[PDB]
């Protein structure tokens, strides 16, 4: 189900997903100097029923001192959330790349990646993208 690796993280390029396939997990992590609330949740899970998909376990933090069938959307930011998000994607996930600010794309093809399943191992197709300043 889950992909045992992250996207290839092309240098000078970031990535994001338009929608998250059911089964995606978002770790509940907070800034420095803040901690996950006690008795809180470790991750949010994208679940769904015959007509809906939502996230399961709302995150929290405290001081340390249109829809698409079968997909969730971006969960809203929560207070004192970390600067980045950790996702645990599943096979059939599509992630699009984009050159970081200040760069430009030296190609005309699609900057897309997909988590495939073959021979018991899952890894993402190498994007055909190059970023140059």
């Amino acid at each position: 189900e889950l992909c045992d690796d992250d996207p290839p993280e092309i240098p000078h390029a970031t990535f994001k997903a338009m929608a998250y396939k059911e089964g995606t997990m978002l770790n509940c992590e907070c800034k420095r100097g803040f901690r996950r609330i006690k008795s809180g949740s470790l991750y949010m899970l994208c679940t769904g029923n015959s007509s809906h998909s939502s996230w399961d376990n709302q995150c929290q933090c405290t001081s340390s001192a249109a829809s698409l069938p079968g997909h969730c959307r971006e969960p809203p930011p929560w207070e004192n959330e970390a600067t980045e998000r950790i996702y645990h994607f599943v096979v059939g996930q599509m992630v699009y790349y984009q050159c970081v600010q200040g760069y430009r794309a030296l190609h005309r093809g699609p900057a897309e990646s997909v988590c495939k399943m073959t021979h018991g191992k899952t890894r993402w197709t190498q994007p055909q993208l190059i970023c140059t300043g």
Partner: antibody, heavy 119, light 107 residues
Framework: QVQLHQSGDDLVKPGASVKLSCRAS????????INWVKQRPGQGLEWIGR????????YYSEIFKGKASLTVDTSSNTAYIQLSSLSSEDSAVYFC????????????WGQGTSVTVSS | QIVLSQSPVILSASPGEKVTMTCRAS?????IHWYQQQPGSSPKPWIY???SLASGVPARFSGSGSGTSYSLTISRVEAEDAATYYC?????????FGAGTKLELKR
Amino acid sequence: QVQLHQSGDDLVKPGASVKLSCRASGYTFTSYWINWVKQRPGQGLEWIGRILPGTNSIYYSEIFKGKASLTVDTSSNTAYIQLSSLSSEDSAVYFCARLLWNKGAMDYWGQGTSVTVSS
Amino acid sequence: QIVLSQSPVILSASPGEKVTMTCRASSGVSSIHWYQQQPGSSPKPWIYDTSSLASGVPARFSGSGSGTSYSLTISRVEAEDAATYYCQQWSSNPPTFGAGTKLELKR
């Protein structure tokens, strides 16, 4: 077994409006989406819109925005689609369908409702 | 919106022959569904998720593909297979169908 049954073949004049129905059976009506599809003679299928009976949620295709409207009557678990400003190109077979959510497919279809317009 | 193109438009295969059909997406999609519509009848689910042979379907059909190229294959044609097959995607809104590829028997 699930079953969807639609109205019979309807013939109407150009410029008028008509309502096509698709009564559901064999499953909970408000727990699933109902999709509408169009098939002009020898031209392939064409998705129209979505409607959830129990939540009053409606989505449309950019092509059909305003040319069709989806309504529901939860008392008799029947779905409706109303077509307005009918023209010569609107003659086709219309299917109601049920959305398999986790797969993003259609798992049950109606028998089709032919509609033709002529002078 | 994604455009799916199926070729060949009309395919003629002798019974017992192994044949393949292709649906090609303008932009990559996660999976493709397939339907079979006999004349004067509604479409019938055939292959979900490009590999999940739909329940009640003969085991002679199989599908596989990835990215922007997918294919529906028949191990051996039979009389019941005279119909048209449509590929579908819902990786983005709105969902789209192919133009259809008819199946005919040789003589």
